[PDB]
């Protein structure tokens, strides 16, 4: 009746369930919902898992192209001595698909999903488009979307450092001062970032991040390569895109 999967679980994993919905429209581009509710303890991760972690994503069966994953922003956690990065309790990830040239959208979601170990368990999605997205679609969708860094406002610059396996940041709040800050990190390929170190006085915030390689050791140096995290004060959420090193 509708493009949704009702909620499904898989009998080996008693601690998520997840959910997908969809529309199409006339143009072929298709908005999908991806709702996942955890039980208490477990969490799922964000795209920079941390050490240890795996981020969820799904295998389409059909061949889509521009595949947008939009990331809510995420929450940290230091469970059972492991640093990592992602959601508790329930998370919905709103997607976006061009070119199908299909009314069917075959998929599977590989969820990761994290107490102390990290369980991966795969889940098969199913979407008639050319049935209704549910009544409350464009609503949910939107909820969801609000939950998304943007890439403008909160700071107005940004400039960073690295030596000694240490990067440092230094970040101007465009308005105000800074309340309760959060930063969340994507390390380049093949290193580690340590728990971030955040001092802040008026509109200024330094970060201090302890850098590795993927063994644990002093990292080489990584000046140059991309500088990409989430901050995050009073409700609002900011996408960061440069360069490590500059200013």
């Known amino acids: 009746s509708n493009a949704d999967t009702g909620w499904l679980t898989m009998p080996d994993n008693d601690h998520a369930q997840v959910r997908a919905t969809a529309d199409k429209s006339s143009t072929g581009d ?5 709702e996942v509710q955890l ?8 795209r920079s898992p941390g050490e240890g972690g795996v981020a969820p994503e799904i295998n389409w069966t059909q061949s889509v192209s521009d595949m947008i994953w939009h990331w809510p922003s995420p929450s940290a956690f230091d469970v059972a001595g492991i640093h990592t990065q992602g959601y508790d309790k329930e998370v919905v990830f709103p997607i976006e698909l ?27 999605l199913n979407l008639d488009l050319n049935e209704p997205a549910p009544a409350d679609f464009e609503w949910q969708y939107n909820q969801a979307m609000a939950k998304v860094p943007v890439t403008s406002g ?5 400039s960073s ?47 201090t991040v302890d850098v590795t390689d993927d063994w644990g050791d002093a990292a080489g ?9 989430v901050v995050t004060d009073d409700g609002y959420s900011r996408q960061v895109n440069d360069t490590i090193g500059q200013g």
């Open 161 to 207: 450092d690295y030596r000694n396996s240490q990067l440092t940041l230094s970040l101007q709040r465009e308005q105000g001062d800074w309340h309760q800050p959060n930063i969340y990190l994507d390390p380049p390929q093949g290193m580690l970032y340590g728990i971030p170190q955040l001092t802040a006085k008026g509109d200024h915030l330094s970060v």
């Open 154 to 158: 909160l700071i107005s610059a940004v």
């Open 30 to 34: 298709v908005k999908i919902l991806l």
């Open 98 to 124: 061009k070119s199908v040239d299909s009314d069917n959208l075959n998929g599977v979601l590989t969820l990761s999903t994290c107490s102390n170990v990290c369980i991966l368990t795969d889940y098969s």
């Open 221 to 229: 140096d990584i000046t140059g390569k991309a500088l990409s995290f």
């Open 39 to 46: 039980a208490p303890g477990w969490k799922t991760y964000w």
